[PDB]
Amino acid sequence: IGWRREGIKYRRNELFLDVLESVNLLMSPQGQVLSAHVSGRVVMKSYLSGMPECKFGMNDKKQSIAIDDCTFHQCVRLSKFDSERSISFIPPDGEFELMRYRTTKDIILPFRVIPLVREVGRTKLEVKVVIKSNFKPSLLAQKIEVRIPTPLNTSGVQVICMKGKAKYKASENAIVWKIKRMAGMKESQISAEIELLPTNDKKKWARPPISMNFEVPFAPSGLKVRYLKVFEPKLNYSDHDVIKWVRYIGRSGIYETRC
Amino acid sequence: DYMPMS
């Protein structure tokens, strides 16, 4: 084997699985989903003694989710998954990327955005934006940002938001709303008044989408890791002896709700 | 966060 050395020794035999998903979405103003996909990588941090063959299993089609197509680290017997749905491999030591993958079916959209806009005459905008967290409530979304674009003839913006904090970054012609943490199945809202300058009347505005960024401790695809079995047949340790850890990091990618 | 595997 060219990627792993033969005499590795660890007193403490531990491994760490990271499911890393970028979720991506474009939503019409009426709540219909125009496009959606997940890019995911699975990264393994492994400290295992010797040369262990590992079998890695998830919910490839409790639940069952449907992976569309994926690609593996060379270390994986491609044919061992080509007739049994069992990903098998001897891992490299240290950190490495076991697979990347993509997912479009039956996604979990961590947040729904409900924009509401009202034209108080040629001078004001009245605007409310509600976000709903749509995941298990024992879980905390963190690093929530709600970017609300503003017009170019803007002459000041007052806002109220009971949760979070909100600047008007006029350099970027948008309102940034920032929320440190939010639990699942919750509603938070922001209200804004957008004082306006007169503008060339014909030259008119098309509300660009409201974009979000967020991090959530679960895989939006619905993927869930089910086993990482470790067999090492020359050495007097076995599976019960390995200390195992999983974590999920679903990040936003393109996450635009259309106004 | 890292949870153990059950």
mmCIF file of C-alpha atoms in Angstrom:
data_model
loop_
_atom_site.group_PDB
_atom_site.id
_atom_site.type_symbol
_atom_site.label_atom_id
_atom_site.label_comp_id
_atom_site.label_asym_id
_atom_site.label_seq_id
_atom_site.Cartn_x
_atom_site.Cartn_y
_atom_site.Cartn_z
ATOM 1 C CA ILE A 1 0.000 0.000 0.000
ATOM 2 C CA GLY A 2 1.308 3.346 -1.103
ATOM 3 C CA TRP A 3 -0.670 5.720 1.088
ATOM 4 C CA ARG A 4 -0.328 3.977 4.482
ATOM 5 C CA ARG A 5 2.752 2.742 6.336
ATOM 6 C CA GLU A 6 2.858 -0.713 7.856
ATOM 7 C CA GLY A 7 3.908 -0.416 11.498
ATOM 8 C CA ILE A 8 1.543 2.210 12.952
ATOM 9 C CA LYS A 9 0.971 2.076 16.719
ATOM 10 C CA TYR A 10 -1.586 3.992 18.801
ATOM 11 C CA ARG A 11 -2.367 3.342 22.466
ATOM 12 C CA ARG A 12 -5.646 5.237 22.106
ATOM 13 C CA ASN A 13 -7.441 4.047 18.926
ATOM 14 C CA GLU A 14 -9.840 6.848 17.928
ATOM 15 C CA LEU A 15 -11.610 8.064 14.805
ATOM 16 C CA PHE A 16 -13.555 11.202 13.902
ATOM 17 C CA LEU A 17 -16.089 11.470 11.095
ATOM 18 C CA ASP A 18 -17.033 14.865 9.688
ATOM 19 C CA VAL A 19 -20.034 15.115 7.361
ATOM 20 C CA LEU A 20 -19.584 18.476 5.619
ATOM 21 C CA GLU A 21 -22.535 19.658 3.537
ATOM 22 C CA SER A 22 -23.108 22.862 1.595
ATOM 23 C CA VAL A 23 -26.867 23.270 1.060
ATOM 24 C CA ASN A 24 -27.999 25.420 -1.869
ATOM 25 C CA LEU A 25 -31.381 26.877 -2.761
ATOM 26 C CA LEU A 26 -33.295 29.303 -4.933
ATOM 27 C CA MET A 27 -36.926 29.963 -3.994
ATOM 28 C CA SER A 28 -39.675 31.755 -5.909
ATOM 29 C CA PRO A 29 -41.607 34.555 -4.184
ATOM 30 C CA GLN A 30 -44.555 32.162 -3.655
ATOM 31 C CA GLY A 31 -42.643 29.462 -1.797
ATOM 32 C CA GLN A 32 -42.080 27.043 -4.680
ATOM 33 C CA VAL A 33 -38.524 25.683 -4.822
ATOM 34 C CA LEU A 34 -36.890 26.572 -8.137
ATOM 35 C CA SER A 35 -33.575 24.720 -7.653
ATOM 36 C CA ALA A 36 -31.916 22.887 -4.810
ATOM 37 C CA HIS A 37 -28.880 20.705 -4.237
ATOM 38 C CA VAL A 38 -26.341 19.584 -1.624
ATOM 39 C CA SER A 39 -22.602 19.230 -2.068
ATOM 40 C CA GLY A 40 -21.101 17.086 0.635
ATOM 41 C CA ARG A 41 -17.721 15.741 1.532
ATOM 42 C CA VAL A 42 -17.037 13.122 4.205
ATOM 43 C CA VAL A 43 -13.704 13.516 5.979
ATOM 44 C CA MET A 44 -12.158 10.965 8.330
ATOM 45 C CA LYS A 45 -9.719 11.636 11.149
ATOM 46 C CA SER A 46 -8.387 8.202 12.100
ATOM 47 C CA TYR A 47 -5.795 7.054 14.666
ATOM 48 C CA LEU A 48 -5.857 3.278 14.285
ATOM 49 C CA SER A 49 -3.131 0.769 14.975
ATOM 50 C CA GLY A 50 -1.664 -1.210 12.095
ATOM 51 C CA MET A 51 -3.528 -1.788 8.815
ATOM 52 C CA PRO A 52 -7.266 -2.061 9.445
ATOM 53 C CA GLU A 53 -9.868 -2.729 6.766
ATOM 54 C CA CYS A 54 -12.891 -0.486 7.428
ATOM 55 C CA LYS A 55 -16.473 -0.808 6.212
ATOM 56 C CA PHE A 56 -18.420 2.485 6.177
ATOM 57 C CA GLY A 57 -22.199 2.549 6.029
ATOM 58 C CA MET A 58 -24.870 5.219 5.954
ATOM 59 C CA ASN A 59 -28.514 5.398 4.829
ATOM 60 C CA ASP A 60 -27.911 4.954 1.109
ATOM 61 C CA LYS A 61 -31.156 3.811 -0.544
ATOM 62 C CA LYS A 62 -35.128 5.454 10.818
ATOM 63 C CA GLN A 63 -34.756 6.914 7.306
ATOM 64 C CA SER A 64 -33.252 6.268 3.887
ATOM 65 C CA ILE A 65 -31.913 9.020 1.649
ATOM 66 C CA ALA A 66 -30.970 8.897 -1.997
ATOM 67 C CA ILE A 67 -27.448 9.832 -3.071
ATOM 68 C CA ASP A 68 -27.316 10.913 -6.721
ATOM 69 C CA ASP A 69 -23.667 10.295 -7.612
ATOM 70 C CA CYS A 70 -20.413 10.379 -5.701
ATOM 71 C CA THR A 71 -16.661 9.791 -5.959
ATOM 72 C CA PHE A 72 -14.308 8.140 -3.439
ATOM 73 C CA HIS A 73 -10.754 8.202 -2.171
ATOM 74 C CA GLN A 74 -8.540 5.769 -4.035
ATOM 75 C CA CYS A 75 -8.275 3.696 -0.838
ATOM 76 C CA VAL A 76 -11.881 2.456 -1.358
ATOM 77 C CA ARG A 77 -12.590 -0.840 -3.096
ATOM 78 C CA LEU A 78 -14.810 0.600 -5.816
ATOM 79 C CA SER A 79 -16.172 -2.877 -6.559
ATOM 80 C CA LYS A 80 -16.980 -3.559 -2.877
ATOM 81 C CA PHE A 81 -19.645 -0.829 -3.152
ATOM 82 C CA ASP A 82 -20.470 -1.893 -6.753
ATOM 83 C CA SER A 83 -22.535 -4.904 -5.631
ATOM 84 C CA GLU A 84 -23.390 -4.628 -1.922
ATOM 85 C CA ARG A 85 -23.706 -0.929 -0.961
ATOM 86 C CA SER A 86 -20.797 -1.567 1.468
ATOM 87 C CA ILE A 87 -18.018 1.023 1.146
ATOM 88 C CA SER A 88 -14.849 -0.827 2.180
ATOM 89 C CA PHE A 89 -11.278 0.421 2.583
ATOM 90 C CA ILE A 90 -8.026 0.537 4.517
ATOM 91 C CA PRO A 91 -7.680 4.194 5.559
ATOM 92 C CA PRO A 92 -4.622 6.416 5.447
ATOM 93 C CA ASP A 93 -3.384 7.617 8.764
ATOM 94 C CA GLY A 94 -4.311 11.114 9.861
ATOM 95 C CA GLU A 95 -6.933 13.203 8.083
ATOM 96 C CA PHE A 96 -8.212 12.475 4.587
ATOM 97 C CA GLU A 97 -11.338 12.908 2.484
ATOM 98 C CA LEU A 98 -13.250 9.662 2.049
ATOM 99 C CA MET A 99 -15.773 10.901 -0.511
ATOM 100 C CA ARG A 100 -17.475 13.911 -2.060
ATOM 101 C CA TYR A 101 -21.139 13.605 -3.126
ATOM 102 C CA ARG A 102 -24.201 15.501 -4.435
ATOM 103 C CA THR A 103 -27.886 15.393 -3.447
ATOM 104 C CA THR A 104 -31.009 16.936 -4.887
ATOM 105 C CA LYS A 105 -33.882 14.730 -3.685
ATOM 106 C CA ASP A 106 -35.772 15.308 -0.423
ATOM 107 C CA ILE A 107 -33.587 18.033 1.031
ATOM 108 C CA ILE A 108 -34.039 19.708 4.407
ATOM 109 C CA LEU A 109 -34.177 23.459 4.098
ATOM 110 C CA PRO A 110 -32.994 24.690 7.511
ATOM 111 C CA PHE A 111 -34.628 28.115 7.153
ATOM 112 C CA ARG A 112 -37.679 29.508 5.388
ATOM 113 C CA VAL A 113 -37.719 33.231 4.571
ATOM 114 C CA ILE A 114 -40.975 35.146 4.399
ATOM 115 C CA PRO A 115 -40.447 38.598 2.948
ATOM 116 C CA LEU A 116 -43.165 41.211 3.118
ATOM 117 C CA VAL A 117 -42.823 44.562 1.358
ATOM 118 C CA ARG A 118 -45.073 47.638 1.330
ATOM 119 C CA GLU A 119 -44.658 50.960 -0.527
ATOM 120 C CA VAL A 120 -45.535 53.877 1.734
ATOM 121 C CA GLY A 121 -45.655 56.296 -1.207
ATOM 122 C CA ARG A 122 -42.698 57.628 -3.192
ATOM 123 C CA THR A 123 -40.741 58.230 0.061
ATOM 124 C CA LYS A 124 -40.841 55.160 2.368
ATOM 125 C CA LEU A 125 -40.566 51.384 2.382
ATOM 126 C CA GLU A 126 -42.166 49.326 5.115
ATOM 127 C CA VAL A 127 -40.530 45.891 5.218
ATOM 128 C CA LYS A 128 -40.904 42.816 7.444
ATOM 129 C CA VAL A 129 -38.840 39.646 7.045
ATOM 130 C CA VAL A 130 -39.598 36.483 9.033
ATOM 131 C CA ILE A 131 -37.269 33.518 9.189
ATOM 132 C CA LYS A 132 -38.446 30.124 10.434
ATOM 133 C CA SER A 133 -36.002 27.449 11.561
ATOM 134 C CA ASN A 134 -37.231 24.152 10.189
ATOM 135 C CA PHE A 135 -35.259 21.441 12.008
ATOM 136 C CA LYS A 136 -35.274 19.581 15.313
ATOM 137 C CA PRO A 137 -35.540 22.045 18.253
ATOM 138 C CA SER A 138 -32.876 20.436 20.409
ATOM 139 C CA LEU A 139 -30.438 21.808 17.815
ATOM 140 C CA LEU A 140 -28.939 25.261 17.440
ATOM 141 C CA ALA A 141 -28.360 26.912 14.130
ATOM 142 C CA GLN A 142 -25.507 29.361 14.518
ATOM 143 C CA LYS A 143 -23.900 32.159 12.475
ATOM 144 C CA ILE A 144 -27.210 33.235 10.963
ATOM 145 C CA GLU A 145 -27.050 36.186 8.544
ATOM 146 C CA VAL A 146 -30.076 37.561 6.690
ATOM 147 C CA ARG A 147 -29.034 39.875 3.884
ATOM 148 C CA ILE A 148 -31.890 42.125 2.747
ATOM 149 C CA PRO A 149 -30.986 44.195 -0.332
ATOM 150 C CA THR A 150 -31.958 47.857 -0.410
ATOM 151 C CA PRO A 151 -32.566 50.264 -3.312
ATOM 152 C CA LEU A 152 -29.939 52.674 -4.556
ATOM 153 C CA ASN A 153 -31.844 55.892 -3.775
ATOM 154 C CA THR A 154 -31.865 55.015 -0.063
ATOM 155 C CA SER A 155 -31.472 57.894 2.379
ATOM 156 C CA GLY A 156 -31.412 56.107 5.703
ATOM 157 C CA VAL A 157 -32.857 52.945 7.229
ATOM 158 C CA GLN A 158 -34.352 52.452 10.677
ATOM 159 C CA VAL A 159 -34.844 48.865 11.845
ATOM 160 C CA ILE A 160 -36.162 46.942 14.814
ATOM 161 C CA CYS A 161 -35.290 43.349 15.560
ATOM 162 C CA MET A 162 -36.068 41.706 18.871
ATOM 163 C CA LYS A 163 -33.570 38.913 18.305
ATOM 164 C CA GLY A 164 -30.196 39.478 16.768
ATOM 165 C CA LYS A 165 -28.521 42.687 15.599
ATOM 166 C CA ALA A 166 -28.878 44.532 12.276
ATOM 167 C CA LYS A 167 -26.650 47.073 10.468
ATOM 168 C CA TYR A 168 -27.445 48.975 7.287
ATOM 169 C CA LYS A 169 -24.295 48.528 5.223
ATOM 170 C CA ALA A 170 -24.973 51.199 2.597
ATOM 171 C CA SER A 171 -21.654 50.574 0.849
ATOM 172 C CA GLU A 172 -23.086 47.180 -0.131
ATOM 173 C CA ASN A 173 -26.695 48.431 -0.439
ATOM 174 C CA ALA A 174 -28.136 45.791 1.861
ATOM 175 C CA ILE A 175 -29.329 45.271 5.406
ATOM 176 C CA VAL A 176 -27.328 42.656 7.299
ATOM 177 C CA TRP A 177 -29.256 40.974 10.135
ATOM 178 C CA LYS A 178 -27.050 38.794 12.345
ATOM 179 C CA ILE A 179 -28.242 36.176 14.839
ATOM 180 C CA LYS A 180 -25.735 34.251 16.954
ATOM 181 C CA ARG A 181 -27.988 31.242 17.660
ATOM 182 C CA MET A 182 -31.494 30.028 16.894
ATOM 183 C CA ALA A 183 -33.142 26.762 17.797
ATOM 184 C CA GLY A 184 -35.274 24.595 15.556
ATOM 185 C CA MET A 185 -38.953 25.308 14.941
ATOM 186 C CA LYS A 186 -38.757 29.006 15.903
ATOM 187 C CA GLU A 187 -39.781 32.314 14.302
ATOM 188 C CA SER A 188 -37.837 35.549 14.420
ATOM 189 C CA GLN A 189 -38.665 38.682 12.487
ATOM 190 C CA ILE A 190 -37.184 42.032 11.534
ATOM 191 C CA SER A 191 -38.993 45.268 10.591
ATOM 192 C CA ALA A 192 -37.402 48.069 8.527
ATOM 193 C CA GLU A 193 -38.341 51.509 7.269
ATOM 194 C CA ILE A 194 -36.374 52.574 4.209
ATOM 195 C CA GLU A 195 -36.494 56.312 3.573
ATOM 196 C CA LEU A 196 -36.084 57.047 -0.148
ATOM 197 C CA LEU A 197 -34.612 59.693 -2.368
ATOM 198 C CA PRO A 198 -36.397 60.723 -5.551
ATOM 199 C CA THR A 199 -35.040 58.777 -8.476
ATOM 200 C CA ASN A 200 -35.317 58.708 -12.224
ATOM 201 C CA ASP A 201 -38.849 57.441 -12.444
ATOM 202 C CA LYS A 202 -38.586 55.189 -15.499
ATOM 203 C CA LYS A 203 -35.331 53.646 -14.248
ATOM 204 C CA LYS A 204 -37.088 51.313 -11.799
ATOM 205 C CA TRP A 205 -36.075 48.574 -9.318
ATOM 206 C CA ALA A 206 -36.251 44.758 -9.384
ATOM 207 C CA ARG A 207 -36.110 43.352 -5.826
ATOM 208 C CA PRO A 208 -33.052 41.090 -5.796
ATOM 209 C CA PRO A 209 -33.410 38.057 -3.553
ATOM 210 C CA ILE A 210 -32.924 37.884 0.167
ATOM 211 C CA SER A 211 -29.873 35.712 0.794
ATOM 212 C CA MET A 212 -29.000 33.838 3.959
ATOM 213 C CA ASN A 213 -25.932 32.266 5.454
ATOM 214 C CA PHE A 214 -26.043 29.873 8.375
ATOM 215 C CA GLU A 215 -24.404 26.836 9.967
ATOM 216 C CA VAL A 216 -26.486 23.915 11.287
ATOM 217 C CA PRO A 217 -25.294 20.792 13.183
ATOM 218 C CA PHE A 218 -26.942 18.300 10.832
ATOM 219 C CA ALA A 219 -26.702 17.106 7.231
ATOM 220 C CA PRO A 220 -29.383 18.907 5.144
ATOM 221 C CA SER A 221 -29.340 16.028 2.648
ATOM 222 C CA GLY A 222 -30.744 13.809 5.404
ATOM 223 C CA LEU A 223 -27.641 11.632 5.386
ATOM 224 C CA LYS A 224 -26.925 9.873 8.672
ATOM 225 C CA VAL A 225 -23.800 7.793 9.392
ATOM 226 C CA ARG A 226 -24.688 4.324 10.662
ATOM 227 C CA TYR A 227 -21.447 2.438 11.217
ATOM 228 C CA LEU A 228 -17.706 2.658 10.851
ATOM 229 C CA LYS A 229 -16.595 -0.900 11.475
ATOM 230 C CA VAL A 230 -12.863 -1.492 11.998
ATOM 231 C CA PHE A 231 -11.347 -4.970 11.690
ATOM 232 C CA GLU A 232 -7.625 -5.527 12.213
ATOM 233 C CA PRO A 233 -6.879 -9.223 12.185
ATOM 234 C CA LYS A 234 -3.227 -9.353 13.172
ATOM 235 C CA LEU A 235 -3.803 -7.188 16.250
ATOM 236 C CA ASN A 236 -5.499 -7.952 19.564
ATOM 237 C CA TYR A 237 -7.878 -5.027 19.356
ATOM 238 C CA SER A 238 -11.307 -5.109 17.731
ATOM 239 C CA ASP A 239 -14.328 -2.921 17.085
ATOM 240 C CA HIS A 240 -15.585 -2.377 20.666
ATOM 241 C CA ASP A 241 -12.109 -0.984 21.410
ATOM 242 C CA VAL A 242 -12.177 1.849 18.859
ATOM 243 C CA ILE A 243 -13.357 5.215 20.157
ATOM 244 C CA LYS A 244 -15.585 6.740 17.493
ATOM 245 C CA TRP A 245 -16.988 10.236 16.903
ATOM 246 C CA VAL A 246 -19.308 11.861 14.370
ATOM 247 C CA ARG A 247 -20.221 15.444 13.774
ATOM 248 C CA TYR A 248 -22.261 17.228 11.141
ATOM 249 C CA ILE A 249 -21.545 20.670 9.670
ATOM 250 C CA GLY A 250 -24.116 21.844 7.135
ATOM 251 C CA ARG A 251 -23.229 25.311 5.810
ATOM 252 C CA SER A 252 -25.172 27.617 3.536
ATOM 253 C CA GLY A 253 -24.157 27.976 -0.036
ATOM 254 C CA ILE A 254 -26.363 29.867 -2.430
ATOM 255 C CA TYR A 255 -29.496 30.368 -0.348
ATOM 256 C CA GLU A 256 -31.635 33.005 -2.049
ATOM 257 C CA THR A 257 -35.352 33.537 -1.537
ATOM 258 C CA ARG A 258 -36.787 35.688 -4.304
ATOM 259 C CA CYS A 259 -38.767 38.795 -3.392
ATOM 260 C CA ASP B 1 -20.483 18.943 17.602
ATOM 261 C CA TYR B 2 -18.832 15.533 17.873
ATOM 262 C CA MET B 3 -21.287 12.952 19.306
ATOM 263 C CA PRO B 4 -20.114 9.354 19.827
ATOM 264 C CA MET B 5 -21.330 6.635 17.531
ATOM 265 C CA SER B 6 -23.949 4.345 19.038
#
